[PDB]
DNA sequence: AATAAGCGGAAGTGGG
DNA sequence: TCCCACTTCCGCTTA
């Protein structure tokens, strides 16, 4: 099954959810969810992943922080906003 | 308070 | 056996 930084990644390249999350800096890989409009974004992850329980936001950004020591996800310092690894974004492009 | 978000340990589930 | 990659639940903290 899809990882959730690869989930993520290709909602920015489609656009699909332009409502609920965007890049703040594509360039350096910084992007940032609606604090009105991001449980739509969690629910279809959840669904993707076929969870027993309804996803919800804050699971969604728990999982998100774990990626914070092994690098492909971390957390900036504003509301909602988080940024990929150079990594991630070469190997996805 | 009401609302929202952040911090993150610990235990449970998936698929190797 | 025992790690993967989260998921779920909980209690605390900050704005
Ligand atoms: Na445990
Ligand atoms: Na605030």
Redesign the pocket.
């Known amino acids: 099954?899809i990882?959730?930084?690869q989930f993520l990644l290709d909602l920015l390249r489609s656009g699909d959810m332009k409502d609920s999350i965007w890049w703040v800096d594509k360039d350096k890989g910084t992007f940032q969810f609606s604090?009105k409009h991001?449980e739509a974004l969690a629910h279809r992850?959840?669904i993707q992943?076929?969870?027993?329980?309804?996803?919800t936001?804050?699971?969604?950004?728990?999982?998100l922080?774990?990626?914070g020591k092994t690098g492909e996800v971390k957390?900036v310092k504003k509301?909602?906003?988080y940024q990929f690894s150079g990594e991630v974004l070469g190997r996805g492009g």
Request: charged share 40%; net charge positive; no cysteine.
């Open positions: 099954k990882r959730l930084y604090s991001k992850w959840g992943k076929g969870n027993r329980k309804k996803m936001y804050q699971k969604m950004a728990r999982a922080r774990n990626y957390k509301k909602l906003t």
